[PDB]
Amino acid sequence: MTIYVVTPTYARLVQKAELVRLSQTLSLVPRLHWLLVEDAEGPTPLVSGLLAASGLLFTHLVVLTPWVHPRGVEQRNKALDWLRGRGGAVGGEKDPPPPGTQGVVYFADDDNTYSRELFEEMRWTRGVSVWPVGLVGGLRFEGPQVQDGRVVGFHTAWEPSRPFPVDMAGFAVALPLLLDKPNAQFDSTAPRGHLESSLLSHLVDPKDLEPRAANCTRVLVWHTRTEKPKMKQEEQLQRQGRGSDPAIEV
Amino acid sequence: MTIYVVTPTYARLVQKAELVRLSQTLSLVPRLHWLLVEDAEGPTPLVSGLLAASGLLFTHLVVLTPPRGVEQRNKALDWLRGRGGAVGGEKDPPPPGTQGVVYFADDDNTYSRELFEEMRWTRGVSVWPVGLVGGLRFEGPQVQDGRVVGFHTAWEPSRPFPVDMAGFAVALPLLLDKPNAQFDSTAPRGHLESSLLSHLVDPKDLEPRAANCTRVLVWHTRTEKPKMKQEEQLQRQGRGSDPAIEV
Numbered sequence: 001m002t003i004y005v006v007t008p009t010y011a012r013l014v015q016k017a018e019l020v021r022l023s024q025t026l027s028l029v030p031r032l033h034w035l036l037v038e039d040a041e042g043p044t045p046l047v048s049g050l051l052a053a054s055g056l057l058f059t060h061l062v063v064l065t066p067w068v069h070p071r072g073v074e075q076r077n078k079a080l081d082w083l084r085g086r087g088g089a090v091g092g093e094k095d096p097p098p099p100g101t102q103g104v105v106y107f108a109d110d111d112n113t114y115s116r117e118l119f120e121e122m123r124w125t126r127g128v129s130v131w132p133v134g135l136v137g138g139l140r141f142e143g144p145q146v147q148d149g150r151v152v153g154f155h156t157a158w159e160p161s162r163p164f165p166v167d168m169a170g171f172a173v174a175l176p177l178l179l180d181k182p183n184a185q186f187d188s189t190a191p192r193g194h195l196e197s198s199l200l201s202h203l204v205d206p207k208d209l210e211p212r213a214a215n216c217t218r219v220l221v222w223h224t225r226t227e228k229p230k231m232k233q234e235e236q237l238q239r240q241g242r243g244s245d246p247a248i249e250v
Numbered sequence: 251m252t253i254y255v256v257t258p259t260y261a262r263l264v265q266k267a268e269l270v271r272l273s274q275t276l277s278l279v280p281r282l283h284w285l286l287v288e289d290a291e292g293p294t295p296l297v298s299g300l301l302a303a304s305g306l307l308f309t310h311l312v313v314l315t316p317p318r319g320v321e322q323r324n325k326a327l328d329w330l331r332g333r334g335g336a337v338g339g340e341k342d343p344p345p346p347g348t349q350g351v352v353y354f355a356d357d358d359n360t361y362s363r364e365l366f367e368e369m370r371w372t373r374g375v376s377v378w379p380v381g382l383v384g385g386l387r388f389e390g391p392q393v394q395d396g397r398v399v400g401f402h403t404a405w406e407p408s409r410p411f412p413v414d415m416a417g418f419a420v421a422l423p424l425l426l427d428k429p430n431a432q433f434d435s436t437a438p439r440g441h442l443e444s445s446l447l448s449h450l451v452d453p454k455d456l457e458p459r460a461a462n463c464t465r466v467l468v469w470h471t472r473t474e475k476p477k478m479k480q481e482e483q484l485q486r487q488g489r490g491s492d493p494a495i496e497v
């Protein structure tokens with residue numbers, strides 16, 4: 001089955017480094033379609049070039065981000081729109097799969113770490129599948145508790161009230177189910193930490209989640225974050241007109 | 251031309267995540283032998299297990315530092331010089347007089363596949379720009395007519411080799427020829443790279459790569475320390491994250 005990976009991304013110092021490791025990870029996975037959505041006003045040459053050189057099956061999308069500061073909400077919904085035939089492709093495969101097509105959708109942020117094994121775990125998803133996520137929610141790992149092959153609770157701690165106390169990287173959704181539920185999307189007005197539940201609540205009930213990763217006993221994905229690079233020297237050299245050559249992409 | 255990637259690593263929350271993306275990066279590169287050296291009291295099942303299922307050609311070494319991975323890299327150089335020390339993987343080092351290149355890759359940087367094809371063509375010591383390092387967008391040598399004539403750097407420009415560990419590679423023959431060349435664990439901040447390279451070549455003889463140093467094919471990324479406030483509170487309640495589930 002084909003896996004459609006939804007990844008929002010925005011320009012910043014570490015952007016290319018993040019897309020390089022994510023695209024290189026994805027090149028190790030067969031039958032995978034990358035839906036990269038840029039948080040810009042139009043496509044950027046940095047992303048367009050990386051996609052073209054990646055050698056992956058991809059569709060390039062773009063949508064600008066308009067209190068709770070949720071991130072990548074609009075970009076994730078744009079990919080859902082494209083999948084539901086509302087267009088929006090600025091590059092790559094312009095046409096989305098038609099109804100009846102078997103597939104699984106995974107929302108993969110550009111900074112997390114993904115093992116190649118994780119993708120084979122989600123390839124078998126009928127509705128909504130789940131697995132533990134490492135280093136997230138202030139825990140060593142957060143994840144569903146499984147008994148008799150069924151989800152019977154959650155190992156979590158922060159905002160335990162969440163109907164689905166799981167990170168974006170801890171679940172995948174069957175394509176048919178998303179097309180079958182046109183209203184299912186992420187709610188930008190949802191409280192902090194309730195973004196995942198805003199989508200999932202429209203798709204299934206916690207009891208019906210499909211445990212993957214050896215009945216949720218293996219951590220195959222990590223919610224890593226990259227340190228903001230120090231630019232003190234760059235600033236001094238710039239004030240002296242000797243900044244790093246801008247013609248050299250980083 | 252085989253590339254020997256020397257990588258020091260140590261146990262901490264993000265270790266496995268880092269080794270997963272590094273091993274996955276290396277799985278895309280042909281003719282590569284990974285020399286993973288743990289900074290531990292003894293080999294850990296986590297690392298041994300990851301190496302075994304990586305499908306990569308490797309040698310597993312271990313040496314504790316009572317910390318920049320200096321002692322670990324030197325143990326990889328000792329091994330390369332036939333002094334043994336392997337506790338897993340390929341135990342026999344390359345025979346004397348073999349061809350090859352050595353690259354010192356820390357476990358948290360980001361490496362593009364293209365970077366590795368550049369260094370295979372190393373005669374003595376090759377160099378290239380490194381992104382997000384030394385406080386700059388990128389740091390790298392200035393090339394004129396295929397020759398390094400200077401360095402785009404800022405932080406203490408007095409270093410004879412003002413380049414990050416990720417910005418160079420050494421030909422295996424040259425390392426065997428200079429059996430006394432190794433990292434100085436006492437070298438002050440920022441002088442680690444110079445402590446090795448000074449034993450091998452003159453800055454003027456560095457071989458520029460990455461299209462005469464106009465391309466950034468490696469980035470000095472660092473990973474945030476994960477928040478564990480919730481974990482601590484759960485521990486107090488006797489329900490911390492199951493130790494049997496490796497992270």
Ligand SMILES: O=c1ccn([C@@H]2O[C@H](COP(=O)(O)OP(=O)(O)O)[C@@H](O)[C@H]2O)c(=O)[nH]1
Pocket residue numbers: 007008009010038039065071072073075108109110111225
């Ligand atoms: O203004 C922004 C901020 C973030 N993102 C992206 O949206 C996702 C989530 O943000 P981030 O990884 O920073 O979230 P966190 O680490 O805090 O969950 C990532 O794929 C980012 O590249 C974006 O497109 N625009």
Ligand SMILES: O=c1ccn([C@@H]2O[C@H](COP(=O)(O)OP(=O)(O)O)[C@@H](O)[C@H]2O)c(=O)[nH]1
Pocket residue numbers: 257258259260288289315317318319320322355356357358472
């Ligand atoms: O006690 C330690 C600290 C670090 N390292 C490793 O040595 C290298 C350099 O350290 P680090 O990445 O933290 O350096 P920086 O990013 O600050 O230059 C990395 O491969 C680490 O995994 C190690 O083996 N033992």
Ligand SMILES: [Mn+2]
Pocket residue numbers: 109111112224225
């Ligand atoms: Mn993130």
Ligand SMILES: [Mn+2]
Pocket residue numbers: 356358359471472
């Ligand atoms: Mn580092």
